[PDB]
């Protein structure tokens, strides 16, 4: 599972990741080295371009919001920059030079009498291409196009309207020409996302989960030195999944950061547990890494010790911004007169055969009739009684 899900980690892509204009790119603001490395990591130079941050995790049941793999993020930690990510998207356009000796045009802008442009062109600029560094909201235009209507020559408007649930920002606007002499314009839009509810966080030992709640840092536990954990995970994910390597990684990372040196967790070897226990004892902590935390709510001592230390988490690309969707009434397919598919085309969810079967099993006739006839494709038709057609 970790082999499959480490390829979705958000982090630095390359040294020239800012000069690239790719169709979809995920970057992280503050990547960090793993506390527990591996010789394979050193050889493949994953050390130079990491993907993930070390989080002070306290393995305990802080609230009811960590049940079934969910995690408990820290509001102050997110505010200070933990898990901060950005997404870059590319919109391309080509001014085709048609066979009628006519070509598409970019320029165009509409200005109100007061000296302000129209709202749809608020961040368009005087050259018809969106100004670098300007915010783009939903419905605005960043690439203005007008194609000839006869293929003088008139033009019809085909603008590239931005649509999305959150505002973005234009990062680069590149103009060029290809070999066949067509103008090629690429616009890179970046947007900044902070972790919220629904964002997936892995653990480099499987142990995937989503942020079930975000709580303020005065509510989380704290040790004697005042360290407040960033992410609190449910202990119940350990005994069934049997990941002792996670506990060894936590203790190795704690002993390494206290000693000041990165510690190696190479397969079939690595830094042993006994040296970690010796370093932790010499630093004044417990030999097994379980400290005493005071509760943040009731303020008193927790009745059991809490396993406490750094673990390297990765933020994954399955954020809730790209997953939430709702239709109500929208576009319909031409052939079947039914709602379309895919949230890109504002489609609707499919009530498949087995959902129909379950609704049958309940016996709710009227609900099934409403769901499969009235709300999807109802149609009044005239049928002849004599012939049945």
């Amino acid at each position: 599972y970790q082999c499959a899900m480490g390829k979705q980690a958000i982090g630095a892509i390359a040294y020239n990741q800012f000069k690239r204009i790719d169709t979809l790119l995920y970057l992280m603001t503050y990547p960090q080295q793993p506390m527990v490395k591996t010789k394979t990591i050193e050889l493949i130079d994953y050390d130079k371009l990491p993907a993930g941050q070390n989080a002070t995790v306290a393995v305990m049941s802080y609230s009811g919001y960590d049940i079934e793999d969910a995690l408990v993020l820290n509001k102050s930690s997110i505010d200070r920059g933990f898990g901060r990510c950005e997404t870059r998207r590319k919109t391309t356009t080509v001014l085709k030079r048609y066979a009628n000796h006519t070509q598409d045009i970019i320029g165009g802008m509409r200005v109100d009498e007061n000296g302000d442009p129209i709202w749809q062109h608020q961040s368009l600029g005087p050259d018809g291409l969106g100004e670098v560094g300007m915010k783009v909201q939903s419905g605005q235009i960043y690439i203005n196009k007008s194609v000839p209507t006869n293929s003088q020559t008139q033009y019809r408007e085909a603008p590239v309207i931005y649509r999305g649930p959150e505002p973005s920002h234009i990062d680069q606007v590149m103009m060029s020409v290809s070999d066949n002499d067509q103008a090629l314009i690429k616009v890179l839009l970046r947007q900044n996302r902070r972790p919220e509810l629904g964002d997936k966080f892995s653990s480099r030992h499987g142990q995937k989960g989503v942020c079930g709640i975000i709580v303020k840092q005065e509510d989380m536990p704290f040790n004697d030195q005042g360290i407040v954990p960033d992410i609190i995970m449910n202990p119940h994910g350990f005994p069934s999944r049997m990941t002792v390597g996670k506990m060894i990684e936590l203790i190795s990372g704690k002993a390494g950061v206290l000693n000041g040196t990165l510690e190696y967790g190479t397969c079939f070897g690595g830094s042993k547990l006994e040296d970690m226990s010796k370093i932790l004892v010499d630093q004044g902590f417990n030999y097994s890494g379980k400290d005493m935390l005071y509760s943040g709510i009731t303020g008193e001592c927790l009745q059991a010790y809490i396993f406490f230390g750094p673990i390297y988490y990765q933020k994954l690309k399955h954020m809730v911004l790209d997953k939430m969707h709702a239709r109500a009434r929208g576009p319909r397919a031409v052939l079947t007169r039914q709602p379309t598919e895919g949230r890109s085309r504002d489609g609707g969810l499919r009530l498949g055969e087995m959902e129909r079967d379950c609704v049958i099993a309940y016996g709710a006739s009227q609900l099934l009739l409403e769901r499969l006839m009235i709300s999807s494709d109802a149609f009044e038709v005239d049928v002849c009684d004599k012939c049945g057609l």
């Binding site: 049941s61 802080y62 009811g64 995937k208 989503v210 202990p235 927790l302 059991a304 939430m324 609900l367």
Partner: protein, 243 residues
């Protein structure tokens, strides 16, 4: 379900309803349909409601019940060696009902040194908060792990680890709440008895109270796993090697 409105861009459902959906919070996407006619809406709420579907029709056993991390906290409260004074007991009762239910504190189980209550009395109040509540249940049940008593003639409630629960009146006189008394898959659970005796509303109320209590308790009473819980003792490394 009945809709509530919350500002966090994710659907949220109680974890006790996770088991029938077979859903885990690891990226699961779930669907929401809204009926558009009064007949469909009424049929949905009175046939497919969570309260009217506490039992799976495959065998009749409960399938909507306490999942993991609710069983653990309930067990830790109902442990034999856990005792609470008036302040902590009252705080526990306030957390399970949001300070809305009128409680009546039963006489404490320990009186002479201090006035100490038992967690089993806390669950006795969880089932029946006051005299106005009509929930009165009685049941004898085994637990998942059960050590027989020291002799073959004693009743099952006198077990060594107290793995037998007896509920008379509404008090819990023995046993620890685990995945045979609050969980799913067994026909002698507390919630199943409450359902079959007093309809689904009382079962839902007790379930909500348990969920709130176990959500707000384990934060103020830590429960952790570490390598100290997995490292074998010194003598085990010899016996295992010899065997």
């Amino acid at each position: 379900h009945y809709a509530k409105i919350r500002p966090w861009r994710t659907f949220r459902l109680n974890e006790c309803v996770c088991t029938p959906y077979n859903a885990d919070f690891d990226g699961d996407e779930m669907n929401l349909h809204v009926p558009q006619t009064e007949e469909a809406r009424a049929e949905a709420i009175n046939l497919m409601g969570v309260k009217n579907n506490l039992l799976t029709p495959k065998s009749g056993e409960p399938i909507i019940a306490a999942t993991q991390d609710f069983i653990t906290g309930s067990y830790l409260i109902s442990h034999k060696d856990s005792f609470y004074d008036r302040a902590t007991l009252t705080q526990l009762l306030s957390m399970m009902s949001d300070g809305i239910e009128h409680f009546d504190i039963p006489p404490p189980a320990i009186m002479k040194p201090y006035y100490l209550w038992t967690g089993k009395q806390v669950f006795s109040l969880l089932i029946k908060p006051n005299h106005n509540s009509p929930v009165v249940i009685n049941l004898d049940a085994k637990n998942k792990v059960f050590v027989p008593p020291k002799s073959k003639s004693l009743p099952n409630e006198m077990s060594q680890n107290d793995g037998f629960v007896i509920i008379r009146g509404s008090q819990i006189l023995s046993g620890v709440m685990d995945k045979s008394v609050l969980g799913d898959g067994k026909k002698h659970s507390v919630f199943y008895t409450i359902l079959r005796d007093y309809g689904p509303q009382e079962a839902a109320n007790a379930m909500n109270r348990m969920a709130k209590l176990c959500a707000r308790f384990l934060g103020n009473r830590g429960f952790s796993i570490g390598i100290n819980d997995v490292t074998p003792a010194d003598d085990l490394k010899q016996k295992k090697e010899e065997l």
